[PDB]
Amino acid sequence: QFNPYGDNGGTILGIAGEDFAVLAGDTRNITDYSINSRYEPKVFDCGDNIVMSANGFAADGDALVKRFKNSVKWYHFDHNDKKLSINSAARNIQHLLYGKRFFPYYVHTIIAGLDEDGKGAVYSFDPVGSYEREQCRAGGAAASLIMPFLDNQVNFKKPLKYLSVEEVIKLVRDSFTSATERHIQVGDGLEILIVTKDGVRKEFYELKRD
Template sequence: MECVLGLVGRDFAVVAADTSAVQSILVHKTDEDKVMVLDSHKLMGASGEPGDRVQFTEYIQKNLHLYQFRNTIPLSTAATANFTRGELATALRKNPYMVNVILGGYDKDVGASLYYIDYIATLHKIDKGAFGYGSYFCLSLMDKLYHPDMTLEEAVDLVDKCIKEIRLRLVVAPQNFVIKVVDKDGARELARRELVGDSASAEAAAATTVAA
């Protein structure tokens, strides 16, 4: 029941993802960070098989660092997207990675950009996008509410609307989400959205039981 989404605003890109680590009917943890900071100005949100997701995102991150060490300049966001697509395409004919990626970045000469890359190495530059079961609700909300000149506050509000809809409509909805942003000031975590209501209610009920 994973969900990764992203959008581009006026001069920034936002990438958000759930933080659940799930296998079959079991939730192993609810604080898994699925949005990796690749370098100072790039974010990669990934969904898919946990082993493939962790291995592939780390592989891309380390190769970006290696390129910068060798050439003294970082890859652009577009070059990173094409490198990522190339690695997925190569693996597709050998041992495929079951990973879907939303890549966001900021370049001085281009501004913010966002790329959609799926497990069969499809690459598209997009303004908004989502992966996972949550995309059924996110994409329709984005179609209605998104506009290219969004401020950061408007973008976060749209992400919050998507999270609310996922929690409301999805049968087995992820509890927690992380939201990260990249702009001229770099890539960083912006906020976490944690569903604390249920745990608070459980603690209150436990306290009442003990008191009784």
């Protein structure tokens, strides 16, 4: 029988700050032991200060992101251009994922943004829609390496609540550099999206290409 699933293994990481959020991912797109591309972004700005990433089978994640963005367009049309909150986006994504309960997307989804009070918020999803709000979550091939690095560096050790944006960016870069040194599927590049009250900012860094 035809196998409709694939694997384009990558690594993503979402962290919620005091009044900011960050969602980062490696830009390597691979098939088995081959490299499809060295810069293929997986973290997207979906409007209304919400960043999204769906790591795993790339086609399913692209379809999920496309559907969510179209739904956001219709939400703006039907509700006087009301801003979509992060919790409402999480509920919409849960419904989108569970709509494929018997033919699921083969992805793990992380979204990030600012809540109603202005605090950073990150939501993590299981493949069929089970979701939770978290302070920090890593997903993909090198999560089991990235998480201990952050746990050693930070206390959830200066507390996470008093860290600035630059310090969080440095921690993410160091963890990804270590994972690149240890994991074959991690490298080439790292892209980070930062959400604050002023909007979304993108930063890019190079990683080892071997």
